[PDB]
A paper describes a structure:
The Src homology 3 (SH3) domain is a ∼60-residue modular domain that consists of two antiparallel β-sheets orthogonally packed to form a single hydrophobic core. This domain is present in many proteins and regulates critical cellular pathways by recognizing polyproline-rich motifs (PRMs; Kurochkina & Guha, 2013). Three-dimensional domain swapping (3D-DS) is a mechanism by which some proteins can oligomerize by exchanging identical domains or structural elements between monomers. In previous work, the 3D-DS of the c-Src SH3 domain has been characterized and its dependence on experimental conditions has been described. This work explores the role of the hinge-loop composition by interchanging residues in the RT and n-Src loops between two SH3 domains: one being the c-Src SH3 domain, where 3D-DS has been described, and the other being the Abl SH3 domain, where 3D-DS has not been described to date.
However, the interchange of one or two loops within the Abl SH3 domain produces a noticeable reduction in its stability but does not promote the formation of 3D domain-swapped oligomers. Conversely, replacing the RT and n-Src loop residues in the Abl_Src chimeras with those from the c-Src SH3 domain results in destabilization under identical denaturing conditions. Notably, the Abl_Src-nSrc and Abl_Src-2 chimeras exhibit pronounced destabilization, highlighting a key role for the c-Src n-Src loop residues in determining the stability of these chimeric proteins. In this way, the ΔG values are the same for the WT and Abl_Src-RT, but the Abl_Src-nSrc and Abl_Src-2 chimeras show a noticeable loss of stability. However, Src_Abl-nSrc shows an ordered distal loop in most of the molecules in the asymmetric unit and this chimera does not form the intertwined dimer. The same behaviour can be observed in the Abl_Src chimeras, where the distal loop shows low B factors. Indeed, even though the Abl_Src chimeras are less stable, this reduction in stability does not allow formation of the intertwined dimer.
Residue numbers in the entry: 63 to 120
């Protein structure tokens, strides 16, 4: 399973981060080795987001 929902708005100016909105659904493609960042996919594209900004959806 890899479906999540955003807990908060997140946006960074750094390249390769994805902007997400609270309540938006997303899928996680990859995980960093310390579990702190997730590579997310939404209708707005692909990019990294903090893992503590998302939570699973069954």
């Amino acid at each position: 399973p890899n479906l999540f929902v955003a807990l908060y708005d997140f946006e960074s100016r750094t390249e390769n981060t994805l902007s997400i909105t609270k309540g938006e659904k997303l899928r996680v493609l990859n995980n960093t080795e310390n579990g702190e960042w997730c590579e997310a996919q939404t209708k707005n594209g692909q990019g990294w987001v903090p893992s503590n900004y998302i939570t699973p959806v069954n």
